[PDB]
Symmetry: C2
Subunit: 346 residues, 2 copies
């Protein structure tokens, strides 16, 4: 049963961002409003009973608000009023500011068996962790998922959503029924919807997908050159890929992007990577060599001023296993949750 659901959307979307910063109408298409308010509109046009919670009326003009009201969306300023309404709750909080606050505000008011979905930025696993004390105790009925759009809702390019489902390591953050409800809601207005494990969904579909796609292209370039030209052993290539990506992630975590750049040194990196220009067409490498030679002088200045903080070489998944064997599964999971919250929530 997935027709005429009661839906709550939180956040109309920063129309100044969409209209003037991204200039979506002229460069991508569609008409405002965009984002969360457009999601509410499309859900309502699909026959769902939709409430949009938005505390700031001034976030868009009266003329765009009329578009929302005409779709039959009910607009409220109080998140708690939207919380009591919906069986599915969609957080449209792109800048990861309000996401935790709104979730914490609504969790003790949402109806029995409600599911709460984040749309972008914050990973549903991190959202689950932030809510876990109540989800484990008083609200075991509530599910956590996500509904990541492929492009800003309202633009022609938005043709699907990615829904965060059971994690690769077997964690169910929402019931099968709750996930099915999110999937079918996502399909409103003719959209495609795909379930991807919740521990990877944000890396595939959110704005960080830019980094994912470019890093992946480098990984595949090296895999090809490594195997087909150099005949470097596969396990060696994988070990180097792991160490590269892990080191880069760890340095950003301790030292920020500027500190990470300072540690890896573009000038050294250009010299080493030039030696790997070994086949016909490696446009990813060509592009990187040119970008790294032409860094912004403002970025460069902040890089000399940056401090490289202590950063420990790890094999991360191997370390997880090792921690489980030392202190047991429950305590290891506690350690993983606490440290994930310290980086991604606090």
């Amino acid at each position: 049963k997935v027709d005429n659901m009661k839906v709550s959307v939180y956040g109309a979307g920063n129309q100044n961002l969409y209209i003037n910063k991204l200039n979506l109408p002229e460069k991508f298409g569609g008409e405002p409003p965009y984002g969360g308010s457009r999601m509410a509109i499309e859900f309502a046009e699909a026959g769902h009973d939709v409430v949009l919670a938005e505390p700031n009326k001034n976030i868009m003009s009266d003329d765009l608000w009329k578009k929302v009201e005409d779709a039959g969306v009910k607009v409220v300023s109080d998140d708690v009023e939207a919380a009591k309404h919906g069986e599915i709750h969609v957080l449209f909080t792109p800048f990861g500011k309000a996401t935790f606050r709104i979730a914490k505000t609504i969790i003790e008011h949402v109806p029995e068996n409600a599911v709460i979905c984040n749309t972008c930025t914050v990973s549903p696993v991190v959202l689950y962790y932030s809510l876990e004390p109540i989800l484990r105790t008083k609200r075991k009925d509530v599910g956590i998922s996500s509904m990541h759009p492929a492009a800003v809702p309202g633009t022609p390019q938005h043709g699907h959503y990615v829904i965060g489902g059971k994690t690769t390591d077997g964690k169910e953050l929402a019931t099968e029924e709750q996930i099915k409800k999110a999937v079918e809601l996502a399909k409103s207005a003719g959209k495609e919807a795909y379930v991807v494990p919740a521990d990877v969904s944000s890396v595939v579909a959110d704005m960080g997908s830019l980094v994912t796609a470019v890093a992946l292209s480098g990984v595949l370039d090296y895999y090809t050159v490594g195997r087909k030209i150099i005949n470097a052993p596969k396990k060696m290539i994988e070990q180097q890929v792991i160490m590269t990506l892990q080191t880069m992630a760890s340095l950003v975590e301790t030292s920020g992007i500027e500190g990470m750049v300072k540690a890896l040194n573009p000038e050294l990196l250009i010299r080493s990577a030039s030696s790997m220009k070994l086949l016909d067409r490696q446009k990813d490498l060509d592009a990187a060599l040119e970008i790294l030679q032409n860094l912004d002088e403002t970025l460069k200045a902040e890089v000399e001023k940056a401090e490289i903080k202590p950063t420990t070489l790890v094999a991360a998944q191997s370390l997880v296993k090792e921690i489980k064997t030392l202190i047991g599964g429950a305590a290891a999971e506690g350690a993983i949750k606490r440290s994930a919250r310290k980086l991604f929530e606090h």
Copy 2:
């Protein structure tokens, strides 16, 4: 001048006949480890090259090695007793670890052992740590990463692994100084980089480092200048992406990682991020991912996605240090790092 031992002449068939370095990059054979030996000997050092496989190069190339004043031996133990500095140019499998373990109890007092390519000096240290801890507290571990094949014109420097960013000294200042001088005496520049990052900047995986970095900087620019996303958000997203990718390859291999991330979905989302006039990194990526090899395309669907735990790695390291104490946390980090990168 210094007593130097080099281990491994280099696969001349690979450099000359498979890769055709003389015509595609330049220079003349031999390349790799035997060329390092030649250059060190021509700079006035007392060099032994240990190479058990006489057939690894033609007779004429061996004559070049000998004419440079390199002493060639077939036994790694003889080379072990010779050198104050030991440079491993070792087949890029497990031979690095075997040769290191073979020489460590025979090298002189205060010797330093340097790897050249592939293996991180931190991992080499971990592989030898039960011996370094106790019987050979005097022996240092470092690296001399050429960052190009020695003998090619592109080889102009070495990257030397120094004190780690978290403050571990795997070799003394005096040992690191020898590696620097060994590089400078052969007309190369020498750059000391923390040992925990040196293989990432200098070895073949630097291809991946450069391309991944360019994407990180692309998003940093979009994020700050167009979206006005907060810096910490941008950083959190970068960390999540790079960590998830590393973790998926660790559990599931490159194909499993590709399967988990789904190139078609990824292409669609990343396309929406073409928000600047020139993002050649993104353009190149979209073309690469849209046009994957049909054989590669095939082994990805066949791949299994294994259990993979979302972590904040450095936060988790701090968390384990406080939980079980620094000594036990370091043991856990060492063992688990050896399990992936050595075993």
